[PDB]
């Protein structure tokens, strides 16, 4: 016989790249996703391909605003 299957795209290596509590520079990619599983939060921007990145530096913080998981950057005061 012959199977009509056998194909698959290259895994795109999505998911969270910085988890809550990780301190990030201004511009780091916090999440990679195809929709908005996470929505951009404070000082977090959403890119063309729905990549969540840090608009400002500081620690990643996962929260929820109006029933939508959100990625926030909380500033880290310099000690």
């Amino acid at each position: 016989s012959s199977s009509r299957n056998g194909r698959d795209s290259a895994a795109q290596r999505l998911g969270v790249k910085r988890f809550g509590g990780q301190v990030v520079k201004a511009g780091e990619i916090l999440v990679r996703q195809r929709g908005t599983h996470f929505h951009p939060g404070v000082n977090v921007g959403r890119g063309g391909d729905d990549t969540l990145f840090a608009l400002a530096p500081g620690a990643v913080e996962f929260g929820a605003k109006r029933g939508r998981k959100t990625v926030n950057i909380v500033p880290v005061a310099r000690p």
Binding site: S1, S2, S3, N5
Partner: protein, 136 residues
């Protein structure tokens, strides 16, 4: 006989034969029931055989419920073939039975005849099963 009118996926992984049944583990329709005690793929062939056994024993009268439904397809690659060249096409339909699942149920006046019919079904079945009752 018992065949799904349509399955979303014709070729499925073998249902996992692990754990005790979480649902359908008690008589809920009839007076008596056949409870499984071992894991098995109860094929529709076996279900038909057991159901006919019960109905013919209990003769005229009584009611028989078949709780399980053989909705899981199991494939069989064509005879005398080498490993590979894709998955075989569905060949037989089974119901993933796990221990403690009540496969059949019976409501019949005579307890003697009911137990005999259920025992005959258990004989047609491919695993250990016991005649459980509703009365706990």
């Amino acid at each position: 006989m018992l065949i799904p009118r349509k399955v979303k996926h014709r070729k499925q992984h073998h249902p996992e034969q692990r754990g005790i049944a979480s649902g359908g583990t008690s008589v809920s329709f009839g007076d008596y029931g056949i409870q499984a005690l071992e894991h098995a793929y109860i094929t529709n062939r076996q279900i038909e055989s057991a159901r006919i056994a019960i109905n013919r024993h209990i003769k005229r009268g009584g009611k028989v419920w078949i709780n399980i439904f053989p909705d899981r397809p199991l494939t069989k690659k064509p005879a005398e073939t080498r490993m590979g060249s894709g998955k075989g096409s569905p060949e037989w339909w089974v119901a993933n039975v796990k221990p403690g699942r009540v496969l059949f149920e019976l409501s019949y006046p005579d307890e003697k005849t009911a137990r005999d019919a259920l025992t005959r079904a258990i004989h047609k079945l491919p695993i250990k099963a016991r005649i459980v009752t509703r009365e706990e």
